[PDB]
Structures are given as C-alpha cells and as structure tokens.
C-alpha cells in the first residue's frame, strides 16, 4: 500500500525512523481492514533497520521501505506492504467490550512543577477514553470515573463496574515526569522530558487484574522553563511532548487489542420478565437478531484469605435474540421449564 509515516527525532534517528514505520504500518492495517491487535507483536521484530523484513504467520508477509526523508526535522518514511485481511479469527465474531477508564494519577506532584501540568493524568485519561472509543475495533468506552481502582478491594471494583455497566476498568499511575537539560554553546538549551506510565486493567465481573503493562517515552519540552502549560489546550498536545503522549495512548490501545480482544465477550443478564430476559449489549455492540447464546450461572467468591475467585456453573439454557435496541437487547429462553433458574447477573456467550 501507499502510506506515509511521520515521527520527530528526539535523541536517535533509529527511534524516529522506527516510530514513523510503526505509524505507516498502523495506517496501512487500519485502511486494509486487518485487525490492529496483531500489530503490537510485530514491533519487536522491527528493531533492526533492515531494508527488507520477512515474517511468517501474520497478515503482513514482506515489508519494503522505499523512501526515507528528514524534512522539517522529522523523519518521513514511505513504504509498500502486502496485507492479507483474514475473514476468520477469534476477534471477529465477538460482541464489543464496554470499558471504563478509571482514575490516572501522578504519583509525585513534585515532578509536575515544571509547566504546572498537574491535571496531566485526567486530561490523558480523557485521551485514552477517546482513543478506545473512536479508534479501537473491539472496545466501547462507557466514560471516565473519578474513583481509584485497586487490587486489594475486588468488591469495590465489582460495584463500580456494575454502576457504570463496564466489563473492564482501566487505570494507571504516572510515575515519571522529570526532565534533563542538554546544553550546547552554539545553540540554546534542550529540555528532554520523561513520561512513564503503568497501566492496569481490572475485570469488573470478578475484580481480578487481567492486564498490567508499563510505558516509558522521552520527548523534547519546547516550552520555557517558567512557562505554564495547559494540558487541555492545543499548545500542549501539538508539541513534541503531546505527540509522544498521543503515541503512548495509541500503544495502550494496541496492547489492549493484543491482550483482551480474543477473550470471549460475556454479556450480562439485566432483567428477567418471565420467559424473556434483557441483555446489557445491544445494536451498537454488534448484536444481531437470530443470535444464539448460551447461559452461564455466575458465582464468584472471595476466598478465606480475601482474594477474588471465579466459579461458573454450566447451564442447559440457550437463548435467542428476539428484539434489538441500540444499547440493549431482548432474548427468549428456548427452554421455558428452566426459565425460573435465570437470575440477574448470569452471563451469556454467543454460540459459534
């Protein structure tokens, strides 16, 4: 395909070229309709600066870079790739997963003094929410929350997920915002600022921690030392630091696609009206009429030591979708005599 990759050089030409190649590959995969979950495993094998790349067992086979330019101080890379969009996979027949973006906090407010970027966590969780909402393939964002999610309180995680109707809750801590000064006699000072982050995803059905990853990137701080920067403004997010943080958010989305996309989606029972039950997933999540679903009885217990545990009882109950709304759906129980055993909170999975 014909794609362009744009990335600014911070300290190494190799890193900027690799970032531009990643951007071009991401655009090519998005246009080709291929899954973006598989991209996050291709990057490690892209550390080398070889003109030709060979891969096996992937939707992309050979990568050939034809043009590399450093116009306006940032590397531009033009490549041609062959993408094979597979019609099958463990991610195409699943309903969309609702995700709640939790509180992202700055561990050390001391590091945010330069620029007074103290609301960077909130304005970055907003970016992560919008990235998951309008860029992901298998995720739906149900908003942000002001509460902090911890692994010590699975019950609170379950309650907050129930309140917001979220299958997973994602929250992080920003651990490094410090900067160093590089000085040259010919020119002015260069301030390279750090952005480290540790993201954690919790399963709202049982309170377990299902995802855990750490990110660290560096970018130039173009603003003055004594200048105050607003994190909601376009001045912050159009700068080199802003571009780096946007790339970090994209990597978060790609990692979530890589890890959670092929987990089987489990819509929950919202209400039971005799022989008809209601599902928390609807038309906007990919539900189509005539779908057959299998019911699981949910029983998740905190064990004797306070650690969350999971236990599902298999059921002989199968349901079919009768009416579909934008955000909910109605299902009819195919075994009327077993309809009395369905309670609120039981989960279902689509029969393939």
């Amino acid at each position: 395909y014909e794609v362009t990759g744009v990335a600014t050089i911070v300290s190494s030409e190799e890193t900027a070229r690799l970032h531009a190649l990643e951007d071009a590959l991401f655009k090519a995969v998005n246009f080709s309709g291929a899954d973006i979950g598989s991209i996050s495993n291709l990057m490690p094998l892209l550390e080398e600066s070889r003109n030709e790349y060979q891969f096996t067992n992937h939707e992309v086979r050979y990568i050939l870079v034809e043009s590399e330019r450093k116009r306006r101080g940032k590397v531009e890379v033009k490549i041609r790739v062959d993408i094979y969009p597979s019609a099958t996979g463990c991610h195409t027949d699943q309903y969309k997963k609702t995700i709640l973006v939790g509180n992202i906090e700055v561990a050390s407010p001391q590091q945010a003094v330069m620029g007074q970027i103290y609301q960077v966590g909130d304005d970055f969780s907003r970016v992560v929410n919008r990235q998951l909402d309008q860029t992901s393939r298998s995720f739906v964002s149900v908003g942000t929350t002001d509460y902090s999610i911890s692994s010590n309180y699975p019950a609170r995680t379950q309650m907050i997920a129930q309140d917001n109707g979220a299958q997973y809750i994602i929250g992080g801590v920003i651990t490094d915002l410090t900067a160093t000064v590089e000085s040259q006699l010919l020119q002015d000072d260069i301030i390279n600022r750090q952005f480290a982050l540790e993201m954690k995803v919790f399963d709202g059905k049982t309170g377990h921690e299902v995802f855990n990853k750490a990110y660290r990137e560096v970018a130039r701080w173009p603003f003055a030392k004594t200048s105050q920067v607003d994190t909601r403004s376009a001045r912050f997010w159009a700068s080199t630091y802003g571009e780096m943080m946007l790339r970090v958010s994209r990597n978060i989305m790609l990692d979530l696609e890589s890890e959670l996309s092929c987990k089987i989606t489990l819509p929950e029972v919202v209400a039971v009206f005799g022989n008809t039950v209601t599902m928390d997933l609807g038309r906007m999540h990919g539900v189509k009429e005539g779908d057959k679903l299998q019911l699981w009885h949910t029983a998740s217990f905190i064990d004797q030591n306070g650690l969350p545990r999971n236990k599902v009882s298999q059921s002989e109950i199968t349901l079919t979708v009768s009416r579909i709304y934008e955000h909910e759906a109605e299902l009819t129980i195919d075994q009327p005599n077993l309809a009395s055993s369905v309670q609120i909170g039981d989960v279902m999975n689509k029969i393939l």
Binding site: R283, Y325, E326
Partner: peptide
Amino acid sequence: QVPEKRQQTLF
C-alpha cells in the same frame, strides 16, 4: 468507495 450513512433502525 464511500461509507454509507446509517440505515433504518427502530428504537
């Protein structure tokens, strides 16, 4: 090929 606007939906 242009994406098509949303089709007719009820509720």
